[PDB]
Amino acid sequence: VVIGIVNNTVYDPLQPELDSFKE
Amino acid sequence: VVIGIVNNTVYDPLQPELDSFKE
Amino acid sequence: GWTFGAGPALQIPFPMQMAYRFNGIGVTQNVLYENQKLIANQFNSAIG
Ligand SMILES: *[C@@H]1O[C@H](CO)[C@@H](O[C@@H]2O[C@H](CO)[C@@H](O)[C@H](O)[C@H]2NC(C)=O)[C@H](O)[C@H]1NC(C)=O
Ligand SMILES: *[C@@H]1O[C@H](CO)[C@@H](O[C@@H]2O[C@H](CO)[C@@H](O)[C@H](O)[C@H]2NC(C)=O)[C@H](O)[C@H]1NC(C)=O
Incomplete structure (x- = not known):
């Protein structure tokens, strides 16, 4: 809906x- | 302490x- | 915009100047950014 x-x-x-410590 | x-x-x-990818 | 009222004239597109002038009165710029056509039509009808 925004023009431009x-x-x-x-x-x-x-x-x-999140993934550097959990994974 | 707040009224209403x-x-x-x-x-x-x-x-x-957090639990979507770690778990 | 009004940037010529303080120093050098710094250009800016009129929808974005309209957006910050909407931001100055309290509403956010997104209301303008999906009501641009209605705002322009209201402005044209008023100035007519
Ligand atoms: C920005 O990228 C999106 C990709 O999601 C473009 O969306 C495409 O729009 C055309 C025309 O409506 C469709 O035929 C394609 O199927 C759309 N892509 C997808 C992946 O669905 C969008 O046009 C891009 N916008 C600009 C300004 O480049
Ligand atoms: C909002 O929910 C809380 C849930 O704890 C309500 O607090 C409880 O109110 C009852 C009735 O006075 C007490 O017996 C409990 O001990 C209260 N719980 C705690 C943890 O103190 C509270 O009354 C609710 N407020 C409204 C307006 O519904």
């Missing part, structure tokens, strides 16, 4: 933090 | 994320 919205990726800080 | 406070539940975004 571009394609890019965001960075989740929890994704690389 | 109602009983309800909040959502923790960490809770479903």
Whole structure:
């Protein structure tokens, strides 16, 4: 619905933090 | 101490994320 | 925008200036970002 919205990726800080200790 | 406070539940975004991949 | 009212004239697209001027009154910019067409039509009808 937004006009002019571009394609890019965001960075989740929890994704690389959960797997370094649990996995 | 707060007057008029109602009983309800909040959502923790960490809770479903931590056990989905580690467990 | 109003950036020429403090120093040099720094350009900005008018939907984004509209978004921050909506942010200044209390609402968030997303309400504008899916009500842009309605806001523009309301502005045009009022100025007519
Ligand atoms: C951003 O990336 C998405 C990919 O999800 C693009 O979505 C595609 O849109 C076209 C046109 O509607 C569809 O035919 C494709 O099937 C969509 N891709 C997928 C994977 O479903 C979107 O167009 C991209 N936007 C920009 C501005 O590049
Ligand atoms: C909100 O829920 C809590 C749940 O603990 C209620 O607290 C209980 O109230 C009863 C009735 O006075 C007591 O017998 C319990 O000992 C209380 N629990 C605790 C842990 O102290 C509270 O009354 C509820 N509030 C409303 C407005 O429903």
